[PDB]
Each structure stands twice: as C-alpha cells, then as structure tokens.
Amino acid sequence: NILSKISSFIGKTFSLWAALFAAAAFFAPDTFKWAGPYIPWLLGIIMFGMGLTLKPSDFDILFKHPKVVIIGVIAQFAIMPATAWCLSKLLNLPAEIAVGVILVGCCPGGTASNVMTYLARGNVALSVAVTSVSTLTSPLLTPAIFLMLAGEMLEIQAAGMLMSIVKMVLLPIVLGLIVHKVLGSKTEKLTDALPLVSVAAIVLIIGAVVGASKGKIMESGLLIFAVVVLHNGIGYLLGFFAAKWTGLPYDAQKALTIEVGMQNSGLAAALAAAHFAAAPVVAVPGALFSVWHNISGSLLATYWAAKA
Ligand SMILES: C[C@H](CCC(=O)NCCS(=O)(=O)O)[C@H]1CC[C@H]2[C@@H]3[C@H](O)C[C@@H]4C[C@H](O)CC[C@]4(C)[C@H]3C[C@H](O)[C@]12C
Ligand SMILES: CCCCCCCCCCCC[N+](C)(C)[O-]
Ligand SMILES: CCCCCCCCCCCC[N+](C)(C)[O-]
Ligand SMILES: [Hg+2]
Ligand code: NA
Ligand code: NA
C-alpha cells in the first residue's frame, strides 16, 4: 500500500521532481544523455496511457455542446502559436530559440490541464474534450501552424513532424483506446501504474534534453525561462478573455484559461529532438515549459479552489 502513497506524493509534487531531474542533468549531462534516442518511445508510452484512460463518454460534451468544445480548440491553436510568434518578434529571439518557442506554441494542450481544471472546480468534461480534440487534430494542425509561423523554409522538417505526431501521439492513443474497449473495466489495474510510468518517462525526456544542451542553457537558459513564463502566462490571460468574451459560464472560463496556457510540451521536446537534432537548444523551451506550466497551473488552480 506504501507504493500507492509514494505514487500519490510524487504526482502531487511532480514539478519539484521534474526540476530536480533537470538540475541533475544540468550538473551531470552523462546521467541522462543515453535517454536521447529513447525520447520517441518515452513520449509514445505517455500517449498510450492517455488513450487507455480515454472512454467514449469523454466526447459526450462534444456532441451535446459542440460550440463550447470548438471555441476551446480555436482558442488553443489561435492564442498559443500567435503568442509564441509575438514574443519571438518582441524579444528579438535568435532563430533557434524562436523556432523552439513556436514549436511549443503550435503543440496541442496537455493532459495535466484536466487535473488542474478539477482542482480549480472548473468544467472537467470541457477540459478533457478540448485536450482530446486538440491532440487528435494535432497531426495536421501542429505542422501546418508551425510552417506558417516558423517559415516556409522548414517545409521538410514540418512534413516530417506530421509523421512523428502520427507515430508518437496517434498510433499510441488509438492502441490505448482499443485496449480500453477490449478489457472494459479491467483497464483500471493497468491505469494505476500509469502515473509513476508517465512521470518516469517525462523526467527522462527532460533530463535527456537538458543534458544535450548544457552549453546552450549556460548562455541562454535564463532568457528561455523568461519567454516560457510569459508564453504560458499570456496563454492564461488571453484564454480567460476568450472564454469570457464568447459568453461562456465561469466553470467553462476556468477550464479554457488552464486549457490554453497548459501545453503538451513533451511533444515539443520530442519534435525538436527528432527534426532539429543538430541544434539542441530547440528542445529547451519545450523541456522548461514541462516543468513550469505545472507550477503556474497549480498556483492558478489553488487560487480558484480557495475562491470556490
Ligand atoms: C496528477 C497530478 C496532479 C496531482 C494533484 O492532484 N494534486 C492536488 C493535490 S490536493 O488535491 O490538494 O490533495 C498531475 C500534475 C503533473 C502531471 C504530470 C505532468 O504534467 C507531466 C506528464 C505530462 C504527460 O503529458 C502526462 C503524464 C505526466 C507525468 C502528468 C501526469 C499527471 O497529470 C500529473 C502528475
Ligand atoms: C507501449 C507502447 C506505446 C507505443 C509507442 C510507439 C511509438 C514509437 C516511436 C518510435 C520512433 C523511432 N524513431 C525515433 C526511429 O522514429
Ligand atoms: C473530432 C475529434 C475526434 C473525435 C472522435 C471521438 C470518437 C468518439 C465518437 C463516438 C463513436 C462511438 N459510437 C459509434 C458508439 O458513437
Ligand atoms: Hg508582437
Ligand atoms: Na484539458
Ligand atoms: Na494549451
């Protein structure tokens, strides 16, 4: 039973563990540099877990309230990519950093936003459906939006991103969804192992990325951190006003604020490792975002849980 309490604590203190592993990789790169070629498999395991936990009723809100889910999807792909582009222009970021920030911005939402919405006492059904739709549509929308913002010069890289998202995100989500229909209620035993396995997989992606870019973090790490904080923070701000100005209720407003600001930044780190391998700093905005958004997401959720 102690293993369940240990898993619960690790989950409730994720960011602190992710920050420790990022620091371990920063002081000792050779501890996690071996995980680099395993990054696609590590993210694939996380995506398999999402589909495994995904049931057909998680899409009910999409058929009962299509306009609410669609506003969420539009806000995710309009705000985050535009914010990444604006900050890259505003702060005159060097090309490799700007591409890394645009990549994070073009990614779909993160699973953790579902838990943050539950803690914020927001519309959980809406949070779950927006993440699922943004993720399922990402094979086409992530490379197409990346291509428009980062520039038509990265056509080869963006085309390869479509293939990578199919292999690391779509292939595992589907394989996970079929298992849930196959085993039925028996999948609960397999979902209990998921938090620990997923945490281990993501800290290994973070560790591998930080280790491969020590020198680049030594020169631009602080600038990347400031951009990450502003990117995620502005994502909450614009996400709130998009939910409010479309006339959505308070529960939906909290769901969409978190939805927009929180990103599948592990996918961004994976896509940068696979398509811009010769430039290790490109994966850095994604790696730092995976640590940061959980900290800011819990702060915002805590404020709303205290208010309600
Ligand atoms: C379940 C966690 C939230 C913990 C929580 O509920 N805290 C509230 C405490 S309380 O009510 O006051 O008692 C969240 C926070 C950080 C999340 C993890 C991080 O976002 C990192 C990866 C992200 C991957 O895409 C999914 C797995 C994952 C490894 C996430 C699994 C899970 O959603 C975590 C671990
Ligand atoms: C639990 C299994 C989950 C299935 C995840 C499969 C994703 C495969 C990714 C391998 C990609 C290898 N690579 C880097 C050469 O493209
Ligand atoms: C539009 C984004 C993708 C949404 C796909 C979600 C699949 C759920 C569709 C329900 C299919 C099950 N059925 C046939 C019983 O309705
Ligand atoms: Hg701008
Ligand atoms: Na969500
Ligand atoms: Na998002």
Short mmCIF file of C-alpha atoms and ligand atoms in Angstrom, two decimals:
data_model
loop_
_atom_site.label_atom_id
_atom_site.label_comp_id
_atom_site.label_asym_id
_atom_site.label_seq_id
_atom_site.Cartn_x
_atom_site.Cartn_y
_atom_site.Cartn_z
CA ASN A 1 0.00 0.00 0.00
CA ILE A 2 3.04 2.32 0.65
CA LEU A 3 3.76 2.28 -3.16
CA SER A 4 0.31 3.91 -3.79
CA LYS A 5 1.03 6.72 -1.24
CA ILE A 6 4.55 7.19 -2.78
CA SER A 7 2.96 7.47 -6.30
CA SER A 8 0.30 9.93 -4.97
CA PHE A 9 3.01 12.15 -3.34
CA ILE A 10 5.27 12.05 -6.47
CA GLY A 11 2.18 13.09 -8.52
CA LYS A 12 1.20 15.88 -6.07
CA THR A 13 4.85 17.18 -6.10
CA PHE A 14 5.66 16.47 -9.82
CA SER A 15 7.28 19.87 -10.66
CA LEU A 16 9.76 19.53 -7.77
CA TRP A 17 10.87 16.11 -9.13
CA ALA A 18 10.98 17.39 -12.75
CA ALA A 19 13.09 20.41 -11.60
CA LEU A 20 15.46 18.06 -9.62
CA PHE A 21 15.96 15.80 -12.66
CA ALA A 22 16.52 18.90 -14.93
CA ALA A 23 19.12 20.16 -12.35
CA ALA A 24 20.79 16.65 -12.17
CA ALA A 25 21.11 16.68 -15.99
CA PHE A 26 22.46 20.29 -15.88
CA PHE A 27 25.21 19.43 -13.37
CA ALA A 28 25.86 15.90 -14.79
CA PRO A 29 24.78 15.60 -18.52
CA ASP A 30 26.07 11.98 -18.91
CA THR A 31 23.41 10.80 -16.39
CA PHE A 32 20.55 11.25 -18.89
CA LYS A 33 22.16 11.78 -22.37
CA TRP A 34 21.59 8.00 -23.05
CA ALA A 35 17.76 8.62 -22.92
CA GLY A 36 18.00 10.90 -26.00
CA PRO A 37 17.38 8.16 -28.66
CA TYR A 38 14.54 6.76 -26.46
CA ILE A 39 12.61 10.12 -26.38
CA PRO A 40 10.02 8.97 -29.07
CA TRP A 41 9.36 5.68 -27.17
CA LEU A 42 9.13 7.58 -23.83
CA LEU A 43 6.53 10.04 -25.23
CA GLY A 44 4.76 7.16 -27.05
CA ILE A 45 4.31 5.40 -23.64
CA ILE A 46 2.71 8.61 -22.22
CA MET A 47 0.35 8.93 -25.23
CA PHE A 48 -0.61 5.20 -24.96
CA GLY A 49 -1.62 5.99 -21.33
CA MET A 50 -3.90 8.90 -22.41
CA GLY A 51 -5.90 6.71 -24.85
CA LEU A 52 -6.01 3.90 -22.22
CA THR A 53 -7.73 6.33 -19.75
CA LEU A 54 -9.91 7.72 -22.60
CA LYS A 55 -13.52 6.38 -22.66
CA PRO A 56 -16.24 7.13 -25.35
CA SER A 57 -18.25 9.22 -22.79
CA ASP A 58 -15.29 11.72 -22.64
CA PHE A 59 -16.59 13.03 -26.00
CA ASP A 60 -20.27 13.42 -24.86
CA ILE A 61 -19.84 17.21 -24.36
CA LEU A 62 -18.52 17.43 -28.00
CA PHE A 63 -21.88 16.09 -29.31
CA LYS A 64 -24.12 17.84 -26.68
CA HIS A 65 -22.28 21.24 -26.71
CA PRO A 66 -20.22 21.35 -29.96
CA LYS A 67 -19.74 25.16 -29.97
CA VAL A 68 -18.20 25.18 -26.44
CA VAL A 69 -15.61 22.46 -27.34
CA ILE A 70 -14.88 24.20 -30.72
CA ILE A 71 -14.26 27.61 -29.00
CA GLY A 72 -11.72 25.77 -26.78
CA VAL A 73 -9.98 24.18 -29.80
CA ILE A 74 -9.90 27.55 -31.70
CA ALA A 75 -8.50 29.33 -28.56
CA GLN A 76 -5.80 26.64 -28.15
CA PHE A 77 -4.50 26.95 -31.81
CA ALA A 78 -5.08 30.72 -32.24
CA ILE A 79 -3.60 32.00 -28.88
CA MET A 80 -0.57 29.74 -28.20
CA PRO A 81 1.02 29.85 -31.70
CA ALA A 82 0.35 33.67 -32.07
CA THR A 83 1.73 34.33 -28.53
CA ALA A 84 4.95 32.35 -29.40
CA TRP A 85 5.38 34.34 -32.64
CA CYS A 86 4.68 37.73 -30.93
CA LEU A 87 7.18 37.05 -28.08
CA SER A 88 9.84 35.88 -30.62
CA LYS A 89 9.38 39.19 -32.56
CA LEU A 90 9.04 41.41 -29.40
CA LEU A 91 12.14 39.98 -27.64
CA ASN A 92 14.14 39.58 -30.92
CA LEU A 93 14.99 35.93 -30.02
CA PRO A 94 17.77 34.15 -32.03
CA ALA A 95 16.32 31.82 -34.75
CA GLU A 96 16.95 28.53 -32.80
CA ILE A 97 15.17 29.82 -29.67
CA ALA A 98 12.29 31.39 -31.70
CA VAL A 99 11.75 28.04 -33.53
CA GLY A 100 11.76 26.23 -30.11
CA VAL A 101 9.15 28.66 -28.69
CA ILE A 102 6.97 28.47 -31.86
CA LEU A 103 7.12 24.63 -31.67
CA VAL A 104 5.77 24.66 -28.03
CA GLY A 105 3.07 27.18 -29.08
CA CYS A 106 1.96 25.03 -32.03
CA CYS A 107 1.61 21.89 -29.89
CA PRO A 108 -1.81 20.71 -28.57
CA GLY A 109 -2.89 21.02 -24.93
CA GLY A 110 -1.55 18.95 -22.05
CA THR A 111 -3.28 16.14 -20.09
CA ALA A 112 -2.36 17.82 -16.74
CA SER A 113 -4.89 20.61 -17.59
CA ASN A 114 -7.69 18.02 -16.90
CA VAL A 115 -6.44 17.59 -13.25
CA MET A 116 -5.83 21.38 -12.86
CA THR A 117 -9.44 22.12 -14.00
CA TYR A 118 -10.74 19.52 -11.48
CA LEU A 119 -8.77 21.26 -8.69
CA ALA A 120 -9.87 24.74 -9.92
CA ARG A 121 -13.51 23.37 -9.70
CA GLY A 122 -13.87 24.18 -13.42
CA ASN A 123 -15.77 22.30 -16.16
CA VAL A 124 -13.81 18.96 -16.18
CA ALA A 125 -15.79 17.42 -19.10
CA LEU A 126 -14.89 20.51 -21.22
CA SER A 127 -11.17 20.32 -20.25
CA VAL A 128 -10.96 16.57 -21.15
CA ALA A 129 -12.71 17.07 -24.54
CA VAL A 130 -10.65 20.13 -25.56
CA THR A 131 -7.35 18.27 -24.85
CA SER A 132 -8.60 15.14 -26.76
CA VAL A 133 -9.75 17.12 -29.83
CA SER A 134 -6.63 19.37 -29.92
CA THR A 135 -4.41 16.19 -29.63
CA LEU A 136 -6.34 14.12 -32.27
CA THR A 137 -6.22 17.06 -34.77
CA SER A 138 -2.52 17.94 -33.95
CA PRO A 139 -1.03 15.59 -36.75
CA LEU A 140 -2.18 18.20 -39.29
CA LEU A 141 -2.65 21.43 -37.26
CA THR A 142 0.72 21.30 -35.38
CA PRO A 143 2.92 21.02 -38.58
CA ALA A 144 0.70 23.40 -40.64
CA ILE A 145 0.68 26.14 -37.96
CA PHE A 146 4.44 25.55 -37.32
CA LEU A 147 5.11 26.01 -41.10
CA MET A 148 3.10 29.32 -41.29
CA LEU A 149 4.85 30.86 -38.25
CA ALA A 150 8.44 29.46 -38.32
CA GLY A 151 8.51 29.97 -42.11
CA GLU A 152 8.11 28.01 -45.39
CA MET A 153 11.92 27.27 -45.20
CA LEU A 154 11.24 24.42 -42.73
CA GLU A 155 8.85 22.56 -45.11
CA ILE A 156 10.96 19.31 -44.90
CA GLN A 157 11.02 19.46 -41.07
CA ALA A 158 7.28 20.31 -40.77
CA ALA A 159 6.35 17.43 -43.19
CA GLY A 160 8.40 15.01 -41.03
CA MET A 161 6.59 16.40 -37.93
CA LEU A 162 3.29 15.04 -39.37
CA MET A 163 4.84 11.51 -39.49
CA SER A 164 6.34 11.90 -35.97
CA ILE A 165 2.98 13.02 -34.44
CA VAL A 166 1.25 10.01 -36.12
CA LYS A 167 3.89 7.60 -34.64
CA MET A 168 4.32 9.14 -31.09
CA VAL A 169 0.80 10.53 -30.50
CA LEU A 170 -1.90 8.99 -32.83
CA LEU A 171 -0.56 5.37 -33.07
CA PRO A 172 -0.28 5.03 -29.20
CA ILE A 173 -3.60 6.90 -28.41
CA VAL A 174 -5.53 4.54 -30.77
CA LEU A 175 -3.71 1.37 -29.46
CA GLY A 176 -4.65 2.63 -25.95
CA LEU A 177 -8.33 3.25 -26.90
CA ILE A 178 -8.73 -0.27 -28.38
CA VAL A 179 -7.36 -1.85 -25.13
CA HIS A 180 -10.00 0.11 -23.07
CA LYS A 181 -12.79 -1.37 -25.29
CA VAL A 182 -11.12 -4.86 -25.22
CA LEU A 183 -10.62 -5.19 -21.40
CA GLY A 184 -13.52 -2.90 -20.35
CA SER A 185 -13.37 -2.19 -16.60
CA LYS A 186 -10.21 -4.40 -16.21
CA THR A 187 -8.09 -1.47 -17.59
CA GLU A 188 -8.31 0.21 -14.11
CA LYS A 189 -5.47 -2.08 -12.83
CA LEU A 190 -3.30 -1.02 -15.83
CA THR A 191 -4.13 2.71 -15.23
CA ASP A 192 -2.86 2.52 -11.60
CA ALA A 193 0.74 2.01 -12.88
CA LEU A 194 0.37 4.94 -15.36
CA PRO A 195 1.17 7.98 -13.06
CA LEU A 196 4.57 6.54 -11.99
CA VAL A 197 5.49 5.26 -15.51
CA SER A 198 4.43 8.60 -17.16
CA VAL A 199 6.33 10.70 -14.55
CA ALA A 200 9.47 8.49 -15.11
CA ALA A 201 9.09 8.81 -18.95
CA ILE A 202 8.71 12.67 -18.90
CA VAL A 203 11.62 13.25 -16.40
CA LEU A 204 13.81 11.13 -18.75
CA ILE A 205 12.74 13.33 -21.76
CA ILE A 206 13.52 16.48 -19.64
CA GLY A 207 16.85 15.03 -18.39
CA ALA A 208 17.96 13.94 -21.91
CA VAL A 209 17.09 17.40 -23.39
CA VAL A 210 18.83 19.46 -20.64
CA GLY A 211 21.94 17.21 -20.76
CA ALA A 212 22.32 17.51 -24.57
CA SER A 213 22.03 21.37 -24.32
CA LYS A 214 24.17 22.29 -21.23
CA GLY A 215 26.31 24.89 -23.08
CA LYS A 216 23.27 26.47 -24.79
CA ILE A 217 21.40 26.58 -21.38
CA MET A 218 24.60 28.12 -19.86
CA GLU A 219 24.31 31.01 -22.36
CA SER A 220 20.53 31.43 -22.99
CA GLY A 221 18.75 29.38 -20.24
CA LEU A 222 17.54 32.42 -18.28
CA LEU A 223 16.14 34.10 -21.45
CA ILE A 224 14.36 30.82 -22.40
CA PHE A 225 12.85 30.63 -18.86
CA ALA A 226 11.53 34.26 -19.07
CA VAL A 227 9.95 33.52 -22.55
CA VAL A 228 8.38 30.27 -21.17
CA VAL A 229 6.84 32.17 -18.18
CA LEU A 230 5.49 34.97 -20.48
CA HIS A 231 4.24 32.46 -23.13
CA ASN A 232 2.32 30.34 -20.58
CA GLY A 233 1.16 33.37 -18.50
CA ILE A 234 -0.23 35.28 -21.57
CA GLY A 235 -1.88 31.96 -22.60
CA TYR A 236 -3.86 32.05 -19.30
CA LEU A 237 -4.74 35.82 -19.75
CA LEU A 238 -5.96 35.52 -23.38
CA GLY A 239 -7.61 32.14 -22.63
CA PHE A 240 -9.71 33.77 -19.85
CA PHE A 241 -10.88 36.70 -22.05
CA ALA A 242 -11.62 34.32 -24.97
CA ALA A 243 -13.87 32.24 -22.66
CA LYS A 244 -15.49 35.38 -21.13
CA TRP A 245 -15.98 37.34 -24.43
CA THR A 246 -17.67 34.29 -26.10
CA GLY A 247 -20.19 34.46 -23.21
CA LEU A 248 -19.23 31.13 -21.59
CA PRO A 249 -20.07 30.46 -17.87
CA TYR A 250 -17.46 30.73 -15.04
CA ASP A 251 -16.80 26.92 -14.91
CA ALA A 252 -16.01 26.95 -18.67
CA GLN A 253 -13.88 30.14 -18.24
CA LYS A 254 -11.63 28.36 -15.68
CA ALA A 255 -11.45 25.22 -17.90
CA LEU A 256 -10.36 27.20 -21.02
CA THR A 257 -7.87 29.52 -19.20
CA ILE A 258 -5.90 26.46 -17.96
CA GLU A 259 -6.50 24.63 -21.31
CA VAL A 260 -4.86 27.40 -23.40
CA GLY A 261 -1.87 28.13 -21.08
CA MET A 262 -1.04 24.42 -20.48
CA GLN A 263 0.75 22.61 -23.35
CA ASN A 264 1.89 19.13 -24.45
CA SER A 265 5.49 20.48 -24.15
CA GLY A 266 6.91 16.91 -24.05
CA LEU A 267 5.72 16.57 -27.67
CA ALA A 268 7.56 19.86 -28.46
CA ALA A 269 10.80 18.49 -26.89
CA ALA A 270 10.36 15.21 -28.87
CA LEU A 271 9.69 17.01 -32.21
CA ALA A 272 12.76 19.26 -31.72
CA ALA A 273 14.96 16.21 -30.83
CA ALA A 274 13.72 14.31 -33.95
CA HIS A 275 13.69 17.20 -36.50
CA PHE A 276 16.29 19.73 -35.26
CA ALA A 277 18.77 17.24 -33.63
CA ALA A 278 21.87 19.26 -34.76
CA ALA A 279 20.50 22.28 -32.75
CA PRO A 280 19.93 21.02 -29.13
CA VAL A 281 18.57 24.42 -27.84
CA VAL A 282 15.36 23.99 -29.96
CA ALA A 283 14.14 21.28 -27.48
CA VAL A 284 14.94 23.54 -24.43
CA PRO A 285 11.73 25.76 -24.48
CA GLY A 286 9.68 22.52 -24.51
CA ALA A 287 11.70 20.94 -21.66
CA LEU A 288 11.45 24.01 -19.37
CA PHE A 289 7.73 24.50 -20.22
CA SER A 290 7.01 20.90 -18.97
CA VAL A 291 8.45 21.93 -15.57
CA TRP A 292 6.91 25.49 -15.45
CA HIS A 293 3.24 25.08 -16.58
CA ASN A 294 2.53 22.53 -13.78
CA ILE A 295 3.84 25.09 -11.18
CA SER A 296 1.80 28.01 -12.69
CA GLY A 297 -1.21 25.70 -13.38
CA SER A 298 -1.32 24.55 -9.72
CA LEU A 299 -0.99 28.19 -8.47
CA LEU A 300 -3.93 29.34 -10.66
CA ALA A 301 -5.96 26.17 -9.73
CA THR A 302 -5.19 26.68 -5.99
CA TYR A 303 -6.44 30.31 -6.19
CA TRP A 304 -9.73 29.10 -7.82
CA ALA A 305 -10.13 26.11 -5.43
CA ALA A 306 -9.70 28.58 -2.49
CA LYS A 307 -12.19 31.06 -4.07
CA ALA A 308 -14.81 28.29 -4.67
C1 LIG B 1 -1.88 14.02 -11.05
C2 LIG B 1 -1.01 15.26 -10.88
C3 LIG B 1 -1.83 16.29 -10.07
C4 LIG B 1 -1.68 15.97 -8.59
C5 LIG B 1 -2.82 16.54 -7.78
O1 LIG B 1 -3.95 16.12 -7.97
N1 LIG B 1 -2.54 17.49 -6.84
C6 LIG B 1 -3.56 18.12 -5.97
C7 LIG B 1 -3.29 17.76 -4.51
S1 LIG B 1 -4.77 18.01 -3.49
O2 LIG B 1 -5.94 17.58 -4.16
O3 LIG B 1 -4.69 19.22 -2.73
O4 LIG B 1 -4.65 16.96 -2.39
C8 LIG B 1 -0.51 15.82 -12.26
C9 LIG B 1 0.38 17.10 -12.06
C10 LIG B 1 1.61 16.96 -13.01
C11 LIG B 1 1.14 15.89 -14.02
C12 LIG B 1 2.18 15.21 -14.93
C13 LIG B 1 2.97 16.24 -15.77
O5 LIG B 1 2.16 17.19 -16.46
C14 LIG B 1 3.99 15.57 -16.71
C15 LIG B 1 3.38 14.46 -17.58
C16 LIG B 1 2.61 15.11 -18.74
C17 LIG B 1 2.14 13.99 -19.65
O6 LIG B 1 1.59 14.53 -20.86
C18 LIG B 1 1.12 13.13 -18.89
C19 LIG B 1 1.80 12.45 -17.70
C20 LIG B 1 2.52 13.46 -16.76
C21 LIG B 1 3.51 12.65 -15.91
C22 LIG B 1 1.48 14.17 -15.85
C23 LIG B 1 0.63 13.18 -15.03
C24 LIG B 1 -0.37 13.88 -14.06
O7 LIG B 1 -1.37 14.59 -14.80
C25 LIG B 1 0.34 14.86 -13.13
C26 LIG B 1 1.34 14.06 -12.25
C1 LIG B 2 3.55 0.97 -25.01
C2 LIG B 2 3.88 1.16 -26.50
C3 LIG B 2 3.44 2.56 -26.97
C4 LIG B 2 3.63 2.70 -28.49
C5 LIG B 2 4.54 3.90 -28.80
C6 LIG B 2 5.29 3.66 -30.12
C7 LIG B 2 6.00 4.93 -30.60
C8 LIG B 2 7.17 4.51 -31.49
C9 LIG B 2 8.16 5.66 -31.70
C10 LIG B 2 9.42 5.04 -32.30
C11 LIG B 2 10.07 6.03 -33.25
C12 LIG B 2 11.55 5.67 -33.50
N1 LIG B 2 12.27 6.66 -34.36
C13 LIG B 2 12.96 7.62 -33.49
C14 LIG B 2 13.34 5.98 -35.13
O1 LIG B 2 11.36 7.38 -35.27
C1 LIG B 3 -13.47 15.45 -33.79
C2 LIG B 3 -12.33 14.93 -32.94
C3 LIG B 3 -12.32 13.41 -32.92
C4 LIG B 3 -13.46 12.87 -32.08
C5 LIG B 3 -13.50 11.34 -32.22
C6 LIG B 3 -14.05 10.75 -30.92
C7 LIG B 3 -14.59 9.33 -31.14
C8 LIG B 3 -15.91 9.17 -30.38
C9 LIG B 3 -17.04 9.00 -31.42
C10 LIG B 3 -18.13 8.05 -30.90
C11 LIG B 3 -18.07 6.70 -31.65
C12 LIG B 3 -18.83 5.58 -30.89
N1 LIG B 3 -20.24 5.38 -31.34
C13 LIG B 3 -20.27 4.77 -32.69
C14 LIG B 3 -20.96 4.42 -30.47
O1 LIG B 3 -20.94 6.68 -31.27
HG HG B 4 4.37 41.32 -31.15
NA NA B 5 -7.86 19.51 -20.62
NA NA B 6 -2.78 24.76 -24.36
#
